[PDB]
Amino acid sequence: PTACRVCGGGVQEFLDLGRQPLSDRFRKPDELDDEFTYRLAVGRCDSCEMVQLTEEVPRDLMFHEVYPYHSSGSSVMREHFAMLARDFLATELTGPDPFIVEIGCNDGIMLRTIQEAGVRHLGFEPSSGVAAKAREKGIRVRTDFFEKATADDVRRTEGPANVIYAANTLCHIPYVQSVLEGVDALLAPDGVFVFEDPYLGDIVAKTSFDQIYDEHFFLFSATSVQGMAQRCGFELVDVQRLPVHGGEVRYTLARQGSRTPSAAVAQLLAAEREQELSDMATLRAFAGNVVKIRDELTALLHRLRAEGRSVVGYGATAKSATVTNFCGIGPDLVHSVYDTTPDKQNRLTPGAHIPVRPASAFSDPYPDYALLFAWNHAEEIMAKEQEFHQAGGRWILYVPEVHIR
């Protein structure tokens, strides 16, 4: 039985996705077929209701020099984060000498807008290759994990931060207590710690189990985040639901009693409690639907092969590692996955070993079907690939249900 990373309570498992590889390791075709594996399973803490994995992968195995995810590969997410930055610049960073720290700045997608406004900032990005992309934009970055000690070091030399922001990063961090202690050390007394990550409500609603993989340790909800804040000295004071990444919530934490929570916080809490979001029965129902999706997706893929129709995938997401390894999908059923990230191209997907090719290679003559792993980017992708669909090529989706369109 595993101890909750937030409160030490007991965590009860509800979903076992089996042996999985690291999601963001893309091997050259000639490399030895040996990968690190671990058991991917998800549970819910009994005391604070935090939904979390039952095995941690060590951080250095995931985040390192060759971490391959480039945030700026999505035009939607570029606009999303530039607007968030402008919003901070108009609200929380209007002082005489403001400072914003970003945990997980990646290639600089959000901090470039802060740097272009002349505002003092620091990104923490432990994956040095993408850190260097951000530095080439003029962004100040430390190639370090944010945790208590490194936060202590920044408070000592740089002073208090008015905003600490994390997007798609806090959920990646099992040592959230250490992060919160760092935020306590580093945040101004009237500052905010704002983070946005995939939302448990949307994952349950859409059965989007591919949001569960090595790098997604936590599936936050307003209920669990409220408890986490409270148990660590802070207070959930705003929440905002966002469409990006399959559905997220952006949570705003402040020092306790310093600000009054928006009505939105109580409203979302009440909705989660009404829909019994975090009840073990709800979470096990989700687990049953995950199995139903596996069985229908494999049945379809095998039917398509028996009917002589060609199938590829689109988007070498980290998420897809869960789909192809839980479902047992490899190159005999999906022959290639198309992806815009150079560091992923001419490599093989983890565990399943499907070849990855540049997106520019998805062109006439098109395959009959494309399994859309980057389903959270559907609109942006389909807008760039109208020729495929006009030629009669169709998308296979597995969220919220297996269907073709």
Ligand X SMILES: Cc1cn([C@H]2C[C@H](O)[C@@H](COP(=O)(O)O)O2)c(=O)[nH]c1=O
Decide whether 6 or 293 has the Cβ nearer to Zn ion.
6
Decide whether 162 or 376 has the Cβ nearer to ligand SAM.
376
If binding is defined by CB under 6 A, does position 71 make contact with ligand SAM?
yes
Distances in whole angstroms, Cα of residue 356 to Cα of each of 20, 63, 350, 401: 19, 21, 11, 25
Spatial distance between the Cα atoms of 195 and 197, rounded to a whole number of angstroms: 7
If binding is defined by CB under 6 A, does position 247 make contact with ligand X?
no
Decide whether 129 or 160 has the Cβ nearer to ligand X.
129
Task: Restricting to residues 358-377, name those near ligand X by CB under 6 A.
Answer: 359, 374, 376-377
Among 93, 354, 381, 397, binds ligand X (CB under 6 A): 381
Spatial distance between the Cα atoms of 343 and 362, rounded to a whole number of angstroms: 18
Question: CB 77 → ligand X: shortest distance, Å?
Answer: 7
Provide the CA 48 distance to its chain's centre, in angstroms. 22
Distances in whole angstroms, Cα of residue 390 to Cα of each of 366, 381, 385: 11, 14, 9
Question: CB 56 → ligand SAM: shortest distance, Å?
Answer: 12
Task: Restricting to residues 201-240, name those near ligand X by CB under 6 A.
Answer: none
If binding is defined by CB under 6 A, does position 248 make contact with ligand SAM?
no
Identify whether the C-beta of residue 174 lies closer than 8 Å to the C-beta of residue 217. yes
Q: Is 48 annotated as a binding residue?
A: yes
User: Phi then psi for 230, rounded to 5 degrees?
Assistant: -60, -40
Q: Are strands 37-45 and 355-358 parallel, antiparallel or unpaired?
A: unpaired
Q: Is 187 helix (H, G, I), strand (E, B) or coil?
A: strand
Decide whether 74 or 336 has the Cβ nearer to ligand SAM.
74
Token representation of residue 236:
């959930």
- Segment lying near ligand X (by CB under 6 A), choices 142-150, 228-236, 338-346, 362-370: 338-346
Identify whether the C-beta of residue 358 lies closer than 8 Å to the C-beta of residue 336. no
If binding is defined by CB under 6 A, does position 318 make contact with ligand X?
yes
HSE value, Cβ hemisphere, 13 Å, CA-based, for 345: 11
Comparing C-alpha atoms, which of 120, 159, 163 is closest to residue 139? 120
Token representation of residue 140:
């100040």
Interface residues with Zn ion (CB under 5 A) are: 4, 6-7, 9, 45, 47-48, 50
Among 122, 130, 236, 254, binds ligand SAM (CB under 6 A): 130
Identify whether the C-beta of residue 252 lies closer than 8 Å to the C-beta of residue 234. no
Which one of ligand X, Zn ion, ligand SAM, none is in contact with 48 (Cβ closer than 5 to 8 A by kind)?
Zn ion
Breaks (C-N over 2.5 A) in the chain follow: none
HSE value, Cβ hemisphere, 13 Å, CA-based, for 307: 10
If binding is defined by CB under 6 A, does position 340 make contact with ligand X?
yes
Among 112, 172, 250, 357, binds ligand SAM (CB under 6 A): 172
If binding is defined by CB under 6 A, does position 218 make contact with ligand SAM?
no
Q: Is 346 annotated as a binding residue?
A: no
Decide whether 197 or 235 has the Cβ nearer to ligand SAM.
197
- List the x/- string, 138-157, binding to ligand SAM by CB under 6 A: -------xxx----------
Which one of ligand SAM, Zn ion, ligand X, none is in contact with 6 (Cβ closer than 5 to 8 A by kind)?
Zn ion
H or E element at residue 16:
strand 10-21
Question: CB 351 → ligand SAM: shortest distance, Å?
Answer: 19
Q: Report the chain's terminal Cα–Cα distance, integer Å.
A: 43
Among 182, 315, 367, 393, binds ligand X (CB under 6 A): 315
If binding is defined by CB under 6 A, does position 374 make contact with ligand SAM?
no
Dihedral of CA atoms 153, 157, 158, 159 in degrees, nearest 10, equals 80
Instruction: Output the known binding site.
Output: 4, 7, 45, 48, 69, 71, 106, 125, 127, 146, 168, 175, 213, 318-319, 339-341, 344, 376-377, 384
Instruction: Output the known binding site for Zn(2+).
Output: 4, 7, 45, 48
By CB under 6 A, name the binding residues for ligand SAM.
63, 67, 69, 71, 77, 103-104, 106, 109, 124-127, 130, 145-147, 167-169, 172-173
